[PDB]
Amino acid sequence: SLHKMSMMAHRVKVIPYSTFRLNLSVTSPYNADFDGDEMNLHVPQSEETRAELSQL
């Protein structure tokens, strides 16, 4: 991570055929082509945290 980007939140539509999937829009602030780079994911546990991720 370099700046305020790379930290997006998302909703989820669950997909088969195991891998991730995302929009072609947000690719350049993510600063990653599809050359095999890997992602990192986290899930909140309580509602204050889930709400502030959702709203910010």
Partner 1 sequence: KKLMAQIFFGPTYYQRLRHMVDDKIHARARGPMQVLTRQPVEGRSRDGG
Partner 2 sequence: NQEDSMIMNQSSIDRGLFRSLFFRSYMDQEKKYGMSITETFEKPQRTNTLRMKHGTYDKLDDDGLIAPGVRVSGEDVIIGKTTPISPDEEELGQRTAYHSKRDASTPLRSTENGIVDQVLVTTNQDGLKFVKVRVRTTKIPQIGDKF
Partner 3 sequence: RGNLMGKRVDFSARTVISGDPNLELDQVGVPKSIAKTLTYPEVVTPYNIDRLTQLV
In sequence order, what are the residues at sequence separation of 6 or more whose Cβ sits closer than 8 angstroms to the Cβ of residue 21? 15
H/E run at residue 50: helix 47-55
Please tell me whether residue 18 binds partner 1 under the rule CB under 8 A. Answer: yes
Interacting residues with partner 3 between 13 and 52 (CB under 8 A) = 13-27, 32, 34, 36-43, 45-46
The listed partner (partner 1, partner 2, partner 3, none) that binds 10, CB under 5 to 8 Å by sort, is partner 3
Task: Determine if residue 35 is labeled as part of a ligand binding site.
Answer: yes
CB of 40 to partner 3, least distance (A): 6
d(CA 16, CA 46): 27
